[PDB]
From Swiss-Prot:
This is Camphor 5-monooxygenase. Its EC number is 1.14.15.1. GO terms for molecular function: camphor 5-monooxygenase activity; heme binding; iron ion binding. Heme binds at residue 347. It comes from the Bacteria. Its cofactor is heme. The gene is camC. GO terms for cellular component: cytoplasm.
Length: 404
């Protein structure tokens, strides 16, 4: 517990630990939802993780994401040292400089790219699932959720399949840390992999994402090598743990809810809506911002340099915006969430991510309509900037399945 700053009133202190919240055993969204109990104010200060604010309600979360002038992305992670070291593009930039970098990134992971990749996304899902189907078991996180998005990235980035276990090694070191290296070191090791590739594709561009970013123009001039690297690191990591962990949450839920599986089998037209309602219920990101100036917000004095956690996760779980928020209803009306963020940094990958989710749901239930959690296994969640599932052992009777 860091010393409480004298500008912070004691009545706003609530020592939530985003990397190890109490009651994690109840589920990680449930653990974060403690922040929305009736005796917790809308904006609190936690002394954990160096000390920082947390906005606990959708209205404040969206407001702060809109107000980039006060709430800057230059240090967007807790703890401060990680946020300081972090320099990916565009996530560590504010508008207006951010806008042209975001437009360049949009050309390589935005919507039209989706239609070009869609046949490979479909084929990859089907091939992975058929490999598992006859076995009657898998560790879903390891056997489907991890290989699916990284294979898609390698295709969009024009990288060879054999590079996958090394890239995985490198991203795990960053995003699945064990305290052996600092964020800065893991980040540099990732940059070491990308720097030669960007050099190569600046001399000899192709039509892959790295070539397009590395040869782009921004605010009137060519992008530098360093800018390209910082963009490519985000394009790699952006759709990896988010998708891995979101799919895992979704499949845990479906494994525990035969009635919702049957619903999507009998009414496949509801799968897009189901995707949105799972994105709401199993929202999983929590990053934040740094104050650019002293600012009073919702009656609370914020100080220049204070960090504020703005959990994307919480908006859709807020009872003030969605009734019975922990309940999953594929027929829910007025589904609201900020799962993909809000404001100037609203996820560029969201159309790709929804395609990945919808293809998985449809192709999984087509071949393996009936499955359960392995008997006896205790599913464990993890919490942090991207919350997730540690492992997801599933079982089924292969006689209930079909090759398609
Ligand atoms: C379920 C999956 C995903 C979730 C929940 C998710 C969530 C988010 C969130 C919350 C942000 C905003 C962060 C900020 O405001 O600080 C964001 C930004 C972004 N994400 Fe996604 N993401 C997902 C998938 C992907 C995928 C598949 C990619 C593809 C490479 C991707 C690319 C990006 C990029 C480039 C940005 C930065 C946009 C900018 O800063 O203007 N995302 N994502
Ligand atoms: C107990 N031990 C094990 C530990 C516990 C806790 C911290 C530890 C750290 S730490 O404190 O240095 N690491 C905590 C922050 C790690 C940042 C990961 C995000 C980077 C990639 N993602 C994004 O860019 C994005 C950017 C954006 C938001 C979000 C989703 C998408 C889009 C991708 C993230 C170091 C070592 C050990 C630690
Ligand atoms: K920084």
């Amino acid at each position: 517990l860091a010393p409480l700053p004298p500008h912070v009133p004691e009545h706003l202190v609530f020592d939530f630990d985003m990397y190890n919240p109490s009651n994690l055993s109840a589920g990680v969204q449930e653990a974060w939802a403690v922040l929305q109990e009736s005796n917790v104010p809308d904006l609190v200060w936690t002394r954990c993780n160096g000390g920082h604010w947390i906005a606990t309600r959708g209205q404040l979360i969206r407001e702060a994401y809109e107000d980039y002038r006060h709430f800057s992305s230059e240090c967007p992670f807790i703890p401060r040292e990680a946020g300081e070291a972090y320099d990916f593009i565009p996530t560590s930039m504010d508008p207006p400089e951010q806008r042209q970098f975001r437009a360049l990134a949009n050309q390589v992971v935005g919507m039209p790219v989706v239609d070009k990749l869609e046949n490979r996304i479909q084929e990859l899902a089907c091939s992975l699932i058929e490999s598992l189907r006859p076995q009657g078991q898998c560790n879903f996180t390891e056997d489907y959720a991890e290989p699916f998005p990284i294979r898609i990235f390698m295709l969009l980035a024009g990288l060879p399949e054999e590079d996958i276990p090394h890239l995985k090694y490198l991203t795990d070191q960053m995003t699945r840390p064990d305290g052996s290296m600092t964020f800065a070191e893991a980040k540099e090791a990732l940059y070491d992999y990308l720097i030669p590739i960007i050099e190569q594709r600046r001399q000899k561009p192709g039509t892959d994402a790295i070539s397009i970013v590395a040869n782009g123009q921004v605010n009137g001039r060519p992008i530098t090598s360093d800018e390209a690297k910082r963009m490519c690191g985000l394009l790699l990591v952006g759709g990896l743990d988010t998708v891995v962990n979101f799919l895992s949450f979704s499949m845990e839920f479906l494994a525990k809810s035969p009635e919702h599986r049957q619903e999507l089998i009998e009414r496949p037209e509801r799968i897009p809506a189901a995707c949105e309602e799972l994105l709401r219920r199993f929202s999983l990101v929590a990053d934040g911002r740094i104050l650019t100036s002293d600012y009073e917000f919702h009656g609370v004095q914020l100080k220049k340099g204070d960090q504020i956690l703005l959990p994307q996760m919480l908006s859709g779980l807020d009872e003030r915006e969605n009734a019975c928020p922990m309940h999953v209803d594929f027929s829910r009306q007025k589904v609201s969430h900020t799962t993909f963020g809000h404001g100037s940094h609203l996820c560029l990958g969201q159309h790709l991510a929804r395609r990945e989710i919808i293809v998985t749901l449809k192709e999984w239930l087509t071949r393996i309509p009936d499955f359960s959690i392995a008997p006896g296994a205790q599913i464990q969640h993890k919490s942090g900037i991207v919350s997730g599932v540690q492992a997801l052992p599933l079982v089924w009777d292969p006689a209930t399945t079909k090759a398609v």
